[PDB]
Amino acid sequence: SRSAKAGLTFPVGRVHRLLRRGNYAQRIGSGAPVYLTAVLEYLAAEILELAGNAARDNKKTRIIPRHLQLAIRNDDELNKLLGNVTIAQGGVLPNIHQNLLP
Amino acid sequence: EEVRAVLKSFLESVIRDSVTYTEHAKRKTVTSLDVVYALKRQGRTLYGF
Amino acid sequence: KETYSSYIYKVLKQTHPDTGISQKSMSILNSFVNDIFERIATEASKLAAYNKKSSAREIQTAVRLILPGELAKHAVSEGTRAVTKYSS
Amino acid sequence: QRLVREIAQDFKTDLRFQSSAIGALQESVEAYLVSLFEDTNLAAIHAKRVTIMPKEIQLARRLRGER
Amino acid sequence: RRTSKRSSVMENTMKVYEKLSKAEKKRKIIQERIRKHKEQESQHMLTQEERLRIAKETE
Amino acid sequence: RKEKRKGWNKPDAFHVCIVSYQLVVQDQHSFKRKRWQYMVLDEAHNIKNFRSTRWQALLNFNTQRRLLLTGTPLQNNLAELWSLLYFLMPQTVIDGKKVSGFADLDAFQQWFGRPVDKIIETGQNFGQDKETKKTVAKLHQVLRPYLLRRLKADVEKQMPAKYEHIVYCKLSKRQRFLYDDFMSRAQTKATLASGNFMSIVNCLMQLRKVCNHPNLFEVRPILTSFVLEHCVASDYKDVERTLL
DNA sequence: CCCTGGAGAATCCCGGTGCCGAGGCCGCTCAATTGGTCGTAGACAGCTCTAGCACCGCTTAAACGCACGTACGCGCTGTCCCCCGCGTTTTAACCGCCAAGGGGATTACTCCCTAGTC
DNA sequence: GACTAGGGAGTAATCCCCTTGGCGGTTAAAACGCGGGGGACAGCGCGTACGTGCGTTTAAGCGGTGCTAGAGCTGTCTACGACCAATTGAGCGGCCTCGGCACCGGGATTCTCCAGGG
């Protein structure tokens, strides 16, 4: 397929239809309409690897939403990318002030 | 008292924006997806719904 | 309705063959993918309105200022490699 | 739920809320409040203080220009 | 950058996970021997006279 | 409670544990673990319906011997009896293939059931005993393997008897007013159009009025004057002070 | 002066059984590929034109040292006031009880729609 | 051509499961109150680190100049993208598990307090 011939796996045609419906431009760039899908695929691979690592850390086979929470929050670059958006049933990294301790 | 004031200043504003949005959607009901628009325009988006 | 669960599932499977998923996390990923797509796509639209005229350079540049540069260079490089694979 | 109904009945009757919606705003408000509270904890640990008073809350609210 | 910062984090956390698995295994075996010792020190073979003795003391 | 479950897993900690009906469901997670050799349900009629979570939280309970004690299996329907038989019988066993079910709650409607409460509720003609005796005999035979009842006829040498007496009480004047008002209002509302809906509250509050009488709404109050408080002195006080 | 054996109690942790749902499997299914067009918009010069690079000598305007000096952030003292841990009490949801409609299916009587031959 | 026989719909009776309200029982979370103590903060002293006045220079603005390479618009074509549907498979709609998650127990381990002497 087009993704297979490109080495991709995300459905490019669905995104093409979405962009055509969104009418962000009359004639969208058809030289590489799956490129915007390729960058999203790279970001998704990053976040999925981090989530899988976080889930593996606490001996849980399945991706806990909290596991994804610390996976995204730990990375400073990820926090800069997406920091104004919260995640349902997420959490907060344990941050206790050293001078607060007795 | 101050936290209660924060709720009384935060919840109602997004409530008004949500109800005027779902009225703009011509839907005589409120769904969870309508809250997401308000959260996005308020600068604090929520994932999962 | 066409869901996107299959693609993210197979990406997780090609990066972690024994790690499961949760239903709440499925919606989390779906919303993340959707809103990132929309954000970068309207950025590309405003970049098309940037130039006094009606491709792939616009999307490359749009991904080039929207997300931190460290991952941005990898994103553009892998996108270019993908389009080279798809060219023939 | 009581608070949501009380603050929502002031606009229109027969609203017919869906419990998922109230869950969504519940998560939103708790997240906003914990972010606020950690920020005011930082603002208080600025000063030689470990007890929180209205001054820190007002300063945190005004600094970001919420309203 | 360097195409390996995330991969370096992966390596560090996977070494941490391997140490966690090793701790899991050693604690498994240590509680296995703990259970063995508990079984040896546990009461065995109540029979008749001993069970009635404990029953009359509780009575 | 947690401190009493301190030695819970010890094989020789205890032999019998006594637990309330409201605490088995609360701590069914901590109770479903331990293997119980014998289980007894005191006042077995406390569970009588197949809809309650009380029965469900104990159906799949890990035990092999079950005994239910009740004063008398009673009430209107035999669904209580069928539920009790299921609770003692339960077919759902770890094997799950022996299909040793007694009889389905609907399959018990053919075997007696509808004839039983048909003839029995029409006990005026129950003296015919042509087809009624068939169902009664079938129920007796099917319940004989699991039943044991002994009335006060077994112990009567030293047993004081029961003397039932009914006392008639009149109606007080103001409670009679209350009763008439409520009952006329209820008969005018229920028999025709009404508000949202209300039909059992009429009987319930009528019972309340017959039972207690001059209360549950108001008592005879402590009479005191009305406290009209605007007054007129302060209105003309300023004018008077200006004048003098 | 300050350190700790013992004790009280919270933590980490893996057995250890029950559950419900993640993922696989089945049956449609509708939308991305692909043939062509035809005409649209941007790449390719090309002429033009327009602001900047570096250069020159001034002009005192800022920039910096030196010295006085002086008062404030911080650290010392003390008290006092007020909030927490624990013990006792009261709203606060949740699940059982009952007798009556509502209704949805479900089947019985029957009654007209259908169709045969001396 | 007159009247006969049988079955699904029209009319109707049965069942019966499904919920509306109220009320009582019982556990858990919330509500309230006290001893005492640690956190907040005043009073103060100071020193030393800036707050400020004045000498002595580099430097941005000044005033002007001679052009020079990059930026805007003029044709012009042509490679390409938005215009019908057959398709046919990539994938979703509905169900059925047994396994990881849920969660609590026995124990080892660990975190903390004190009243004394050391």
Swiss-Prot record, chain B:
The nucleosome is a histone octamer containing two molecules each of H2A, H2B, H3 and H4 assembled in one H3-H4 heterotetramer and two H2A-H2B heterodimers. The octamer wraps approximately 147 bp of DNA. Histone H4 is a component of the UAF (upstream activation factor) complex which consists of UAF30, RRN5, RRN9, RRN10, and histones H3 and H4. The modification Omega-N-methylarginine is found at residue 4. The modification N6-acetyllysine is found at residue 28. Transmembrane segments: none annotated. GO terms for biological process: chromatin organization; nucleolar large rRNA transcription by RNA polymerase I; nucleosome assembly; positive regulation of transcription by RNA polymerase I; regulation of DNA-templated transcription. The modification N6-succinyllysine is found at residue 26. Present with 524000 molecules/cell in log phase SD medium. The modification N6-glutaryllysine is found at residue 40. The modification Phosphoserine is found at residues 9, 13. It comes from Saccharomyces cerevisiae (strain ATCC 204508 / S288c). The keyword Transcription does not apply. The gene is HHF1. Glutarylation at Lys-40 (H4K91glu) destabilizes nucleosomes by promoting dissociation of the H2A-H2B dimers from nucleosomes. Core component of nucleosome. Nucleosomes wrap and compact DNA into chromatin, limiting DNA accessibility to the cellular machineries which require DNA as a template. Histones thereby play a central role in transcription regulation, DNA repair, DNA replication and chromosomal stability. DNA accessibility is regulated via a complex set of post-translational modifications of histones, also called histone code, and nucleosome remodeling. The keyword DNA-binding applies.
From Swiss-Prot, chain C:
GO terms for cellular component: nucleosome; nucleus. The keyword Translocase does not apply. The keyword Isomerase does not apply. The modification N6,N6-dimethyllysine is found at residue 1. One of its GO terms (biological process) is postreplication repair. Coiled coil: none annotated. GO terms for molecular function: DNA binding; protein heterodimerization activity; structural constituent of chromatin. The modification N6-succinyllysine is found at residue 10. There is a cross-link at residue 85 (Glycyl lysine isopeptide (Lys-Gly) (interchain with G-Cter in ubiquitin)). It is found in: Nucleus; Chromosome. Keywords: Acetylation, Chromosome, DNA-binding, Isopeptide bond, Methylation, Nucleosome core, Nucleus, Phosphoprotein, Ubl conjugation. Monoubiquitinated by the RAD6/UBC2-BRE1 complex to form H2BK123ub1. H2BK123ub1 gives a specific tag for epigenetic transcriptional activation and is also prerequisite for H3K4me and H3K79me formation. H2BK123ub1 also modulates the formation of double-strand breaks during meiosis and is a prerequisite for DNA-damage checkpoint activation. Deubiquitination is performed by UBP8 in presence of SGF11. Core component of nucleosome. Nucleosomes wrap and compact DNA into chromatin, limiting DNA accessibility to the cellular machineries which require DNA as a template. Histones thereby play a central role in transcription regulation, DNA repair, DNA replication and chromosomal stability. DNA accessibility is regulated via a complex set of post-translational modifications of histones, also called histone code, and nucleosome remodeling. Belongs to the histone H2B family. This is Histone H2B.1. It comes from Saccharomyces cerevisiae (strain ATCC 204508 / S288c) (Baker's yeast).
From Swiss-Prot, chain D:
The modification N6,N6,N6-trimethyllysine is found at residue 12. It is found in: Nucleus; Chromosome. The modification N6-succinyllysine is found at residue 12. The modification N6,N6-dimethyllysine is found at residue 12. Phosphorylated by IPL1 to form H3S10ph in a cell cycle-dependent manner during mitosis and meiosis. H3S10ph is also formed by SNF1, promotes subsequent H3K14ac formation by GCN5, and is required for transcriptional activation through TBP recruitment to the promoters. Dephosphorylation is performed by GLC7. Mono-, di- and trimethylated by the COMPASS complex to form H3K4me1/2/3. H3K4me activates gene expression by regulating transcription elongation and plays a role in telomere length maintenance. H3K4me enrichment correlates with transcription levels, and occurs in a 5' to 3' gradient with H3K4me3 enrichment at the 5'-end of genes, shifting to H3K4me2 and then H3K4me1. Methylated by SET2 to form H3K36me. H3K36me represses gene expression. Methylated by DOT1 to form H3K79me. H3K79me is required for association of SIR proteins with telomeric regions and for telomeric silencing. It comes from the Eukaryota. The modification N6-methyllysine is found at residue 12. Present with 213000 molecules/cell in log phase SD medium. Belongs to the histone H3 family. This is Histone H3.
Swiss-Prot record, chain F:
Disulfide bonds: none annotated. It is found in: Nucleus. It comes from the Eukaryota. A motif (DEAH box) lies at residues 42-45. Catalytic component of the SWR1 complex which mediates the ATP-dependent exchange of histone H2A for the H2A variant HZT1 leading to transcriptional regulation of selected genes by chromatin remodeling. Component of the SWR1 chromatin-remodeling complex composed of at least ACT1, ARP4, RVB1, RVB2, ARP6, YAF9, VPS71, VPS72, SWC3, SWC4, SWC5, SWC7 and SWR1, and perhaps BDF1. Belongs to the SNF2/RAD54 helicase family. SWR1 subfamily. Present with 656 molecules/cell in log phase SD medium. This is Helicase SWR1. It comes from Saccharomyces cerevisiae (strain ATCC 204508 / S288c). The chain holds residues 783 to 1026 of 1514 of the full protein.
